[PDB]
Amino acid sequence: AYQLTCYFTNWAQYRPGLGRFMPDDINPCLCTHLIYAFAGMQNNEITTIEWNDVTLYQAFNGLKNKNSQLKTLLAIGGWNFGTAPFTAMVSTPENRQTFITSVIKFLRQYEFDGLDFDWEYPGSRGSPPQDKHLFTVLVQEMREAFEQEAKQINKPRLMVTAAVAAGISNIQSGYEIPQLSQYLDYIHVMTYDLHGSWEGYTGENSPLYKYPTDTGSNAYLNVDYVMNYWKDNGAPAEKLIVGFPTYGHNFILSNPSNTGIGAPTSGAGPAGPYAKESGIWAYYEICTFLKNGATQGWDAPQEVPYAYQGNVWVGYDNIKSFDIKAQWLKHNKFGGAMVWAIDLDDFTGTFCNQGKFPLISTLKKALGLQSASCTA
């Protein structure tokens, strides 16, 4: 009745010490679907991007030896990849055919159950206005190629899903919603990075509701507005998967006296010692900041925590907020949750003392998957 899809990222293997995350570190009972971020593209054909991806594929797909019900997908693209290869590949029926062929081959060789398109985004970041409809032709042709292939080798069809924008403007220039909804098996809405230091004020990574002071287009940046937009504009509730972040965005406060939602900021907060990402802390990095005596806040209107100390402020998600969001999603009848990323939750259990994978476990309990079988 509910999916729990988890993203695994192939650069987490380079994090130091307790931060290193390999496919073997994934509990196979935890998620219903796991997505491998990312593959790339070369001459219109899907391709690996790390030296050891073939080894990681085997260990990632091998997790299906422990849980017969687990499905895995391979994600192509992502933010860093940009749009240029996608624009050239969709531009002709030949380029699309070359790609779709390379994908059926790749997925079957390395034993994935499907592809997740993570083009960020058709029609933006240099992608021309025609990519919006060409992304639809690609997805339809891919779905249809999957269908034919399932019939001429007699196995279950490969799956096609897509990670899709949460920003209204990116949505408008990127997606034929009703038409894409027919062909995609799931729609993973990136309901996070809704605020960050690029705005010049503090704000939440993934608030559920708007802030009472949010006006104009700032009223759109919350999970409620975003999911209802996708649903009202043609996507069936059951195909729509709400994105949950296991990390938060941090900021430098302009004045360490103003620590509220909306306080002015002078830039990204500092990289953490594990993920090393400017402006972002993994959930487990944030638990260190809390044990460092940071003041804990609760944004009550938006139902999400925040925290601060000296001139550093972070808005993020915890067990309380994941659970609230998860009851909310059940009530609104969405199909499930997607989590970026399994390697950013407290996977060793040692940073937060909330057990192993505290964030994702909350979602597992709340979406009633606690009883889901985990057998070969």
Ligand X SMILES: Cn1cnc2c1c(=O)n(CCCn1c(=O)c3nc[nH]c3n(C)c1=O)c(=O)n2C
Residues annotated within a binding site for chitin: 50-51, 77-80, 121, 190-193, 340
Our CB check for ligand X shows the closer of 89 and 164 to be 164
Residue 80 interacts with ligand X (CB under 6 A): yes or no? yes
Site string for ligand X, 98-127 (x = CB under 6 A): --------------------x---------
Site string for ligand X, 298-317 (x = CB under 6 A): --------------------
Site string for ligand X, 159-178 (x = CB under 6 A): ----x---------------
- Tell me how far, at minimum, the Cβ of 370 lies from ligand X, in Å: 26
b/e code 52-66 from CB counts within 10 Å (16+ = b): ebeebbeebbebbee
**Candidate residues 11, 209, 220, 328; the one interacting with ligand X per rule CB under 6 A:** 11
Residue 329 interacts with ligand X (CB under 6 A): yes or no? no
Rg (CA), the chain: 20
d(CA 369, CA 231): 24
Give the chain's largest Cα–Cα span.
67
Residue 20 interacts with ligand X (CB under 6 A): yes or no? no
**Candidate residues 79, 129, 255, 353; the one interacting with ligand X per rule CB under 6 A:** 79
Known catalytic residue at 199:
no
Spot the catalytic one: 45, 120, 199, 285: 120
d(CA 200, CA 173): 25
Phi, psi of 248 (to 5 degrees): -135, 170
DSSP string, 282-315: EHHHHHHHHHTTPEEEEETTTTEEEEEETTEEEE
Contact of 269 with 313, CB cutoff 8 Å:
yes
3-state secondary structure of 240: strand
Instruction: Identify residues 207-266 at the interface with ligand X (CB under 6 A).
Output: none
- Return binding residues: 50-51, 77-80, 121, 190-193, 340
- Interacting residues toward ligand X by CB under 6 A: 11, 38, 78-80, 118, 163, 190, 193, 196, 198, 279, 340
